[PDB]
Paper text:
Our findings provide insight into the mechanism underlying the activity of MTHFD from B. mori and potentially other insects and may therefore facilitate the development of inhibitors specific to MTHFD as insecticides.
The bmMTHFD structure was determined at a resolution of 1.75 Å by X‐ray crystallography. Site‐directed mutagenesis indicated that the amino acid residue Tyr49 contributed to its catalytic activity.
Author numbering:
A (entry chain B): 1 to 243, 253 to 299
B (entry chain A): 1 to 43, 47 to 245, 254 to 299
The structure:
């Protein structure tokens, strides 16, 4: 039976450490980190997600405030509120909850947030720094996956890693970090040999890559199935949980083969929220330094 | 034997197209695109090649020579003046620059609109989210060679050797990405990125499994005949002085279906794509 990579319990460990580190930094003469989460509409799932971010902020000592807007807000109104938060020195981090209406161009929204306050790390400047393997604000779900590997002592250096999914918000940043060079200034250097599989990878080729992989990360929103015959004995399987939501792994059979595996549910959600808190603390420190 | 992918001849074909499209654009009331290349120290030959292709296609190029003991602030003040110079459409710094010079700061000092090399973090960030951008020229050369030589990429197994921020990373980015996205440069291949810490056994296994190998490490004789799948396409981006590439050329040519030689392969295509990028930037600035 594989070791369980329980992201919920790890997130608790991380949130406890963050609580202490934030208090120490505040005690040097700093204001506690602040985050503003913009919510557009009344999607009940988007409100659950924002409440989770707020509850974790309270736990670690970050001051969070939710700004609710109506589904009919115009793009010009949303960008106007972001630019106001950009210029407000009492705000360290800005998030936009990511089901925004079809009226609004998501790309313009991501790039309107000041990079220094872009807790989601989706601004092109932050993505650019990630991809040249430079210190930046890294997207939280990708950072969560990387943190699960590091905290569970999963060997990446020179190992074969397959990432199933190339999404710009999740799959691409995961692959980029997995093949980072440790020596570079970024320091998020895992040095794995990474194969990026995606919606057009043929089934038989995907299975061959998976059979030779030491690590498989399923990040795609399209239905994939990792079966036991795709898994190298002792390999590490992380299901990111992108998808209402479903699981991408034949857990019962793959657990008999894999060396380490995400449970069902995987806790990647709680890990993502903990990494958002990490990013808010990181941003607050950078701004205080500059 | 392998099909020899004649990059010199393809580059000439592209440069003749550019010459015509630039002249047509100029005739609408526009000034010819201008480029300033900054070189620090001695060796320049690359810059001779850049300036020769610029003259061929109708781009006005000037080279700015600086002695090797220039400081960062001086180099950055030189770039700033060129940013504000409305007669200059494109700026390049001939890297390598001395170690006292921080490359990242210099890359981000060029105005993104004039950054012909595509190394500004804004241009790189747009590349990585599949937006139209100024694409690094060697990476764009590789993608254009795959298209013009009709090398199938959709769902194919590809290996990129090398992670360099200027070459290896953008190649792997475009090669695996979705062509439906706004940039339209994605090639929808399955891509394995191998690098200096890939163990030798696993490197050879990925190479033997690949339909396309793109190597940009600068390690001569890295790719051997027993590492190549029969019929595979071999794109050799490396250029080392012993000018050789990363591939054992005469032996791999017996197994591969298609191969780029060194010299005469990616090199001339890089220069042609630099001219493509200069024309692109001049058009964007006139339209803005």
């Amino acid at each position: 039976m594989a070791r369980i990579l329980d992201g919920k319990a790890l997130a608790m460990e991380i949130k406890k450490e963050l609580k202490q580190k934030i208090a120490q930094w505040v005690s040097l003469g700093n204001r506690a980190p602040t985050i503003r989460c913009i919510i557009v509409g009344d999607d009940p799932a988007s409100h659950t997600y924002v409440r989770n971010k707020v509850e974790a902020a309270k736990f670690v000592g970050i001051d969070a405030l939710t700004i609710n807007r109506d589904s009919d807000i115009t793009e010009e109104q949303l960008l106007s509120e972001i630019q106001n938060l950009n210029e407000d020195n009492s705000v360290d981090g800005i998030l936009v909850q990511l089901p925004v209406p079809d009226t609004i161009n998501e790309r313009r929204v991501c790039d309107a947030i000041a990079p220094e306050k872009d807790i989601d790390g989706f601004h092109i400047i932050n993505i650019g720094r990630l991809c040249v393997d430079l210190p930046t604000i890294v997207p939280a779900t990708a950072l969560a996956v990387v943190e699960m590997l590091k905290r569970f002592n999963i060997d990446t250096f020179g190992r074969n890693a397959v990432v199933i999914g190339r999404s710009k918000n999740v799959g691409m940043p995961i692959a980029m970090m997995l093949h980072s060079d440790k020596r570079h200034e970024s320091g998020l250097g895992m040095d794995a040999t990474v194969t990026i599989c995606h919606r057009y990878t043929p089934k038989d080729k995907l299975e061959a890559y998976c059979r030779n992989a030491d690590i498989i990360i399923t990040a795609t929103g399209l239905p994939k199935l990792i079966k036991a015959d795709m898994v190298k004995p002792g390999a590490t399987i992380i299901d990111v949980g992108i998808t209402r939501l479903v699981g991408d792994v034949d857990y019962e059979e793959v657990s008999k083969i894999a060396g380490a595996i995400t449970p069902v549910p995987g806790g990647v959600g709680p890990m993502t929220v903990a990494m958002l808190m990490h990013n808010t603390f990181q941003a607050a420190q950078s701004q205080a330094n500059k």
